[PDB]
């Protein structure tokens, strides 16, 4: 409902306590005009979990559509049973850094001009439908970094545990 929980705090690692030098950093699969972070096969429980899979969306051009896919509880039996997504009101609410901590922010006021359709292919633009999308504005005046979380690390199967997914969107100034 476009509200923010100003009391919500987290970190990039969350409860995994994984150091940043141990993140699996990779770039988004960019189709030139759509930068996609697809977690559909990145977070399944393994004996080596939890890992931090961090998809980096680097934007320096105008009107880029950002798409983020986070597996849904029940999409596969058991594999995503305790998956959580943050912020729950994404893409309207996003996370940004307050020094070490991550705090909920309205993307409306963080990047003015940014386009969020209420629907993505006829379904609500919310992680509860599996996908969020937002198209960045034609002008960005300052460098801006915000975050989404798709965390499956609390899903476990015997000695297997899922992975914590992070989307880091790094927007360089363009336009002006």
């Amino acid at each position, epitope marked *: 409902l476009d509200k923010i929980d100003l009391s919500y705090e987290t970190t990039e690692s969350g409860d995994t*306590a994984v150091s940043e030098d141990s993140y699996d950093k990779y770039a988004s699969q960019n189709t030139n005009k759509e930068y996609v972070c697809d977690f559909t096969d990145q977070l399944k429980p393994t*004996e080596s979990g939890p890992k931090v899979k961090k998809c980096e969306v680097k934007v320096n051009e105008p009107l880029i559509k950002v798409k983020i896919i986070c597996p849904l509880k029940g999409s596969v039996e058991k594999l995503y049973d305790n998956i959580e997504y943050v912020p729950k009101k994404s893409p309207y609410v996003v996370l940004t850094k307050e020094e070490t901590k991550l705090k909920e922010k309205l993307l409306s006021k963080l990047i003015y001009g940014l386009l969020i359709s209420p629907t993505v292919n006829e379904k609500e633009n919310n992680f509860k439908e599996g996908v969020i999308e937002f198209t960045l504005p034609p002008v960005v005046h300052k460098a801006t970094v915000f975050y989404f979380i798709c965390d499956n690390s609390k899903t*476990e*199967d*015997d*000695n297997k545990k899922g992975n914590r997914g992070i989307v880091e969107v790094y927007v360089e100034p363009y336009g002006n």
Partner: single-chain antibody
Amino acid sequence: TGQVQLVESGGGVVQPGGSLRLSCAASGFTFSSFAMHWARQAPGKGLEWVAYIRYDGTKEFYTDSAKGRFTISRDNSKNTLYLQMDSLRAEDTALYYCAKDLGINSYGYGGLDFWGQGTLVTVSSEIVLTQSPATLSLSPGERGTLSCRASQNVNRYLAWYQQKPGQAPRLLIYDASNRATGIPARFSGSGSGTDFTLTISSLEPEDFAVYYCQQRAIWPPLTFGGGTKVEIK
């Protein structure tokens, strides 16, 4: 439940190279929903994890010393756990506990959240957790602080146990910070990665006991610290 019960049997005195079949009658919970552990405490020593069986009995894990000698099995229609022990050796002398796993609804596997009283077996002749100090002399009312240091990142998957004299271990804290149900609030946990702490805000006379940390981040094997004894000055 508040009526959970585990009753081990089948122990006894055997010579090296002999066999024993341990049994554990499970009561008070949905046995078929929970993985089960065997653990053991050698005379005068700390806690060691032995074996784990999946809720449906289709996957089993073992400590290296038990591989090829011990077989963990279960009958979900008899709510009974078994440990077939073959080719026994003098170092297998220990009190053998059956323990119920903490895991349910896809979270908690590796923690031993309830222990039976145990059955003694006498054979008549890895992530490392460091607990310091080994002994802690304190007075009733003082704040006790126990430390656990892991050889590598165990995330926040560290549990704490209390073994009062003569008694089975009891889960106090799981995943670093989460007090188990029924545990008084004077017990608190903190830490992440490699360094962890258990705080007992005001020691009560019953709190003077041995305490063990345990990791479920990477297993098998499930590993315990050496234990910290909290004595009266």
